[PDB]
Design a protein around this ligand. Structure first.
Ligand SMILES: *[C@@H]1O[C@H](CO[C@@H]2O[C@@H](C)[C@@H](O)[C@@H](O)[C@@H]2O)[C@@H](O[C@@H]2O[C@H](CO)[C@@H](O[C@@H]3O[C@H](CO[C@H]4O[C@H](CO)[C@@H](O)[C@H](O)[C@@H]4O)[C@@H](O)[C@H](O[C@H]4O[C@H](CO)[C@@H](O)[C@H](O)[C@@H]4O)[C@@H]3O)[C@H](O)[C@H]2NC(C)=O)[C@H](O)[C@H]1NC(C)=O
Ligand code: HEC
Ligand SMILES: Nc1cc([C@H](CCN[C@]23CC[C@](c4ccccc4)(CC2)CC3)c2ccccc2)c2nn[nH]c2n1
Ligand SMILES: *[C@@H]1O[C@H](CO)[C@@H](O)[C@H](O)[C@H]1NC(C)=O
Ligand SMILES: *[C@@H]1O[C@H](CO)[C@@H](O)[C@H](O)[C@H]1NC(C)=O
Ligand SMILES: [Ca+2]
Ligand SMILES: [Cl-]
Ligand SMILES: [Cl-]
Lengths: 465, 103
């Protein structure tokens, strides 16, 4: 029953079969490996199979602090009373902190470069080393926590380590909430869906269920359509950083050695700010770096991320496209002509019907990313409904939402309203010219770039006790 | 479940005092629609050869990817209104919300 090396369909394996005339896998007895998600009730003949969320659903920066207590303690520096998160003891990035290394028995990062001998990083979430751009964001927030704990210690010298850790952790979580709901989500949903699904915050409502819904784990994978086929690294003039300024994505997965030995997080953060995202188009859905070569370096065969999304929605028992359209209050097309009208594209409607027979059977990710995008948004109506509905429950059903009374003082809320992702980059990196707000829209140097001194900073004066 | 607190727990337990595991880690997802399985309760569509879904054969996930998702890389359209930071924040944010474990 080894899903990694075998093609036998026996629990817990659900391998993806290979179609005839596949462009890459000529052997039809081969497969793309797949392990079914752990069931919430293993072995049951009574319960309808459901899956598990290993993380806190709240937007609480659990990807920095961890979602389980032993890990949360292990991520802390408990050698002193400074409330810091532990940092790498072997390497620094031009004098700045790096994430500590993990101690995995099976480490995939070590495989990406034998001589480098750079293991996976240890962070609040286990996927921190999946791509260096993601590692750079984790490293940025680790530095921001320590920067806040350091400033809070000089402001309140009697605060012990626990107090410093908890107060800096609270600020980091609020920053993630503000960047997400003020800057990020309006650019995902577009203005009209933003007003519909995320109206003005009123107060904490203890009857709003804050759990992640099973469908969101698949729907939020719309972001796979934004992925560029390279990791772009730029110098301090936002010019290509030679000799490898555009590394194919299939050579950066688990490549923690690139962060440590190829220039740290600054060239990566610059590449993220000054390179456009890929645009999702109906005939340009997702790149072959993830469709043919996902984790190619460390697996026996390259994976197909879009196909894994579809097999995963099947594994999770997710209903098809029309059921979700109906759930959202959206019309459900039954014919290829009706599907053509929804998509403003009869050619794509015919290709979808040739695969699925009926729009009732279109896998949720596939149907969701096929819809024309909402004005000033990057999802169509179906994904905007699922995503918008999820983020409203995470906001209204969170007792520690940054605007909920009792979480912060009014003065602290006013100070927090001045934070931004470009400011976090300024404060924790060697980069002094960053994207202007909104960082998620700004993408061209020098047109959309400003110096760090023009941005407001977080004033911690109202945290003095 | 304490009556008075100041900071979040690490697991998310006690955020909702009436149902204290809601939003907490290592708990089953909530469902917005009932699940759809081949046998009604556990086997995924595509598990058994020849078993149709709602009157139609199940398409291989790799066949749908080959026929609908595949496109020539050089055709990629850069988004004039979004940076690659828009993609990266989405993945970082997703890693604050959900991780579905496998055996
Ligand atoms: C605190 O939040 C509560 C949850 O709110 C939801 O989530 C937030 C994030 C927002 O999206 C919000 O819009 C959501 O509603 C909220 O409580 C909710 O309040 C609504 C409105 O009162 C309740 O809806 C009523 O439900 C009953 C029961 O049937 C429902 O459940 C069954 C089973 O799932 C479904 O099959 C039904 O379709 C319903 O969904 C209905 O009978 C009722 O409709 C009838 O009555 C109204 C007049 O009251 C008529 O206009 C209709 O035509 C019908 O004749 C409503 O649909 C909802 O059940 C309730 N949820 C919970 C969890 O309690 C609460 O009000 C918020 N409080 C504050 C102060 O903000
Ligand atoms: C905006 C959203 C978003 C972006 C961008 C994104 N992902 Fe996804 N991805 C998800 C979510 C949500 C899931 C489901 C996570 C879970 O619950 O386990 C997912 C799941 C996955 C999975 C699990 C596939 C399976 O077996 O079902 C892989 C692998 C993956 N993503 C790789 C990547 C990689 C590699 C990148 C970029 C370097 C990436 N993703 C970027 C949202 C994203
Ligand atoms: N639910 C998920 C899952 C993943 C992957 C799953 C990867 N599975 C492997 C990849 C390589 C492997 C290995 C180890 C040693 C030697 C050779 C190969 C064998 C399978 C270790 C883990 C992940 C999960 C956890 C940590 C990082 C990435 C995601 N990545 N981004 N978003 C994701 N969402
Ligand atoms: C803990 O903090 C001290 C002081 O900043 C530092 O010297 C030490 O390296 C830290 N330890 C870890 C494991 O991060
Ligand atoms: C491995 O890392 C070293 C840097 O220490 C680099 O010179 C070498 O080219 C890398 N090899 C590969 C295959 O990337
Ligand atoms: Ca969380
Ligand atoms: Cl270390
Ligand atoms: Cl669901």
């Amino acid at each position: 029953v080894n899903c990694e090396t075998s093609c036998v369909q026996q629990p817990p394996c659900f391998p993806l079969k290979i179609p005839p005339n596949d462009p890459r896998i000529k052997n039809q007895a081969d497969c793309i490996p797949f392990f079914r998600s752990c069931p919430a009730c293993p072995g049951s003949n009574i319960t309808i199979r459901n899956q598990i969320n290993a993380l806190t659903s709240f937007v609480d920066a659990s990807m920095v602090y961890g979602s389980e207590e032993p890990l949360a303690r292990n991520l802390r520096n408990m050698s002193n009373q400074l409330g810091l998160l532990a940092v790498n003891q072997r390497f620094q990035d031009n004098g700045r902190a790096l994430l500590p290394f993990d101690n995995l028995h099976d480490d995939p990062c070590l495989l990406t470069n034998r001589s480098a001998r750079i293991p996976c990083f240890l962070a609040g979430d286990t996927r921190s080393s999946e791509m260096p751009e993601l590692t750079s964001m984790h490293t940025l927030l680790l530095r921001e926590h320590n920067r806040l704990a350091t400033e809070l210690k000089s402001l309140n010298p009697r605060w012990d380590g626990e107090r410093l850790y908890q107060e800096a952790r609270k600020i980091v979580g609020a920053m993630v909430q503000i960047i997400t709901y003020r800057d990020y989500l309006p650019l995902v949903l577009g203005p009209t869906a933003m007003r519909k699904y995320l109206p003005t915050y009123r107060s904490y409502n203890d009857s709003v269920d804050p759990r992640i819904a099973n469908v969101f784990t698949n729907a939020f994978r719309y972001g796979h359509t934004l992925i560029q086929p390279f990791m772009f690294r730029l110098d301090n003039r936002y010019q290509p950083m030679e000799p490898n300024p555009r590394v194919p994505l299939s050579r950066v997965f688990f490549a923690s050695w690139r962060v440590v030995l190829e220039g740290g997080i600054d060239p990566i953060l610059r590449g993220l700010m000054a390179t456009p995202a890929k645009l999702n188009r109906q005939n340009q859905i997702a790149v072959d770096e993830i469709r043919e070569r996902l984790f190619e370096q460390v697996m026996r065969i390259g994976l197909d991320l879009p196909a894994l999304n579809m097999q995963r929605s099947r594994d999770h028992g997710l209903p098809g496209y029309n059921a979700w359209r109906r759930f959202c209050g959206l019309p459900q097309p039954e014919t290829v002509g009706q599907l053509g009208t929804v998509l403003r594209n009869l050619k794509l409607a015919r290709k979808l019907m040739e695969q699925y027979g009926t729009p009732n059977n279109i896998d949720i990710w596939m149907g969701g990313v096929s819809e024309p995008l909402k004005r000033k948004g990057r999802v169509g109506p179906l994904l905007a409904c699922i995503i918008g509905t999820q983020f409203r429950k995470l906001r209204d059903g969170d007792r520690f939402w940054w605007e909920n009374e009792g979480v912060f003082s009014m003065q602290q809320r006013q100070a927090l309203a001045q934070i931004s992702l470009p400011r976090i980059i300024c404060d924790n990196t060697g980069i002094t010219t960053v994207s202007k707000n909104n960082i998620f829209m700004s993408n061209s140097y020098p047109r959309d770039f400003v110096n760090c001194s023009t941005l407001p900073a977080l004033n911690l004066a109202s945290w003095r006790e | 479940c304490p009556e008075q607190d100041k900071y979040r727990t690490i697991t998310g337990m006690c955020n909702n005092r009436r149902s204290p595991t809601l939003g907490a880690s290592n708990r089953a997802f909530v469902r917005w629609l009932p699940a759809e399985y081949e046998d009604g309760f556990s086997l995924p569509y595509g598990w058994t050869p020849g078993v149709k879904r709602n009157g139609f054969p199940v398409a291989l996930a790799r066949a749908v990817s080959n026929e609908i998702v595949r496109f020539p890389t050089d055709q990629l359209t850069p988004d004039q209104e979004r940076s690659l930071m828009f993609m990266q924040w989405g993945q970082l944010l997703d890693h604050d919300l959900d991780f579905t474990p496998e055996p």
